[PDB]
């Protein structure tokens, strides 16, 4: 015979109103008459806000930088609304509406004449930022499944993690970073300026500790 | 058969140069010498 463990009871998680995701529009309620440059520092480096959870216990953890326009948000919201349970699951958006303007000129035009016209709008997403958060009274298999289904469709790398999974991954990351055999850490060489390496490196590498490059994220750099 | 674009050292698509073992040993010994210098310059 085999043992029969008690099933996890769900009685402290109540579903609020509107379990489905809201509609995301293209341009905001007011257009920006001042054309802004394409500042690339909004996706380079670790994320500051929207890192931990808030209401739900499952969220998609980003592992790279990139821009998401109206089509990506529409695809994500449609997939969520078509692959969920409205009486047992509910998701809340974590990223704001796209507001960064992008200027595009005419096709087949000479270089010059100022900037072009504003077409669509995107939003900056850094590494380690939760894209969407979903909770409810379900378990972990199905939610991880239909969240990785969408994360594989995202341009940048993303995985479906939770609270315990994030805790375990941070624990093994710090365990690997505190038990290094070779005594030559990237931080020790970058901060103390060894062998004149500061000539070919970058001032942003002092805070990244060699864990970021442009927009990607290597979790095996240590 | 495989053709390299304009200049295999500058530009976008370039021929990547990698590391072997002699370079690693040289970096290790240089880091050891520099750590010894740091230790002797700490008093």
């Amino acid at each position: 015979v085999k043992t029969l463990l008690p099933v996890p009871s769900f009685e402290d998680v109540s579903i609020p109103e509107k379990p489905k995701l809201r509609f995301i529009e293209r341009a905001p309620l007011v257009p920006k008459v001042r054309r802004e440059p394409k500042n690339l520092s909004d996706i380079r480096g670790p994320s500051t806000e929207a890192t931990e959870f808030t209401e739900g216990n499952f969220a998609i953890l980003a592992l790279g930088g990139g821009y998401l326009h109206w089509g990506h948000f529409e695809m994500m919201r449609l997939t969520i609304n078509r692959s969920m349970d409205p009486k047992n699951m509910f998701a809340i958006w974590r990223v704001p509406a796209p507001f960064k303007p992008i200027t595009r000129k005419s096709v087949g035009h000479r270089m010059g004449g100022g900037k072009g016209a504003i077409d669509h709008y995107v939003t900056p997403v850094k590494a380690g930022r939760l894209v969407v958060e979903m909770g409810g009274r379900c378990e972990f298999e199905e939610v991880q499944g239909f969240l990785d289904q969408v994360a594989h469709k995202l341009p940048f790398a993303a995985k479906a993690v939770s609270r315990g999974t994030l805790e375990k991954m941070r624990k093994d990351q710090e365990e690997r970073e505190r038990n290094n055999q070779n005594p030559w850490t990237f931080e020790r060489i970058a901060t103390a300026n060894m062998l004149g390496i500061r000539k070919v490196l970058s001032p942003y590498d002092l805070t990244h500790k060699g864990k970021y490059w442009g927009k990607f994220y290597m979790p095996k750099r240590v | 058969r495989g053709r390299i674009p304009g200049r295999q050292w500058i530009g976008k698509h370039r021929r990547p140069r990698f590391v072997s073992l002699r370079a690693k040993q040289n970096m290790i010994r240089r880091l050891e010498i520099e750590a010894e210098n740091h230790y002797w310059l700490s008093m």
Binding site: L40, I43, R44, G65, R176, N180, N182, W184, T185, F186, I189, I197, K199, V200, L201, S202, G210, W213, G214, K215, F216, K220, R221, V222 | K12, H13, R14, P16, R17, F18, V19, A23, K24, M27, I28
Partner: peptide, 25 residues
């Protein structure tokens, strides 16, 4: 000259690559 953030990975410098290869886990 390229920007700091691009999509084609962009191979790093030779010294930076040597430093990342000698300082692995």
């Amino acid at each position: 000259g390229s920007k700091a953030v691009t999509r084609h990975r962009r191979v790093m410098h030779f010294q930076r690559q040597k430093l990342m290869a000698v300082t692995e886990y």
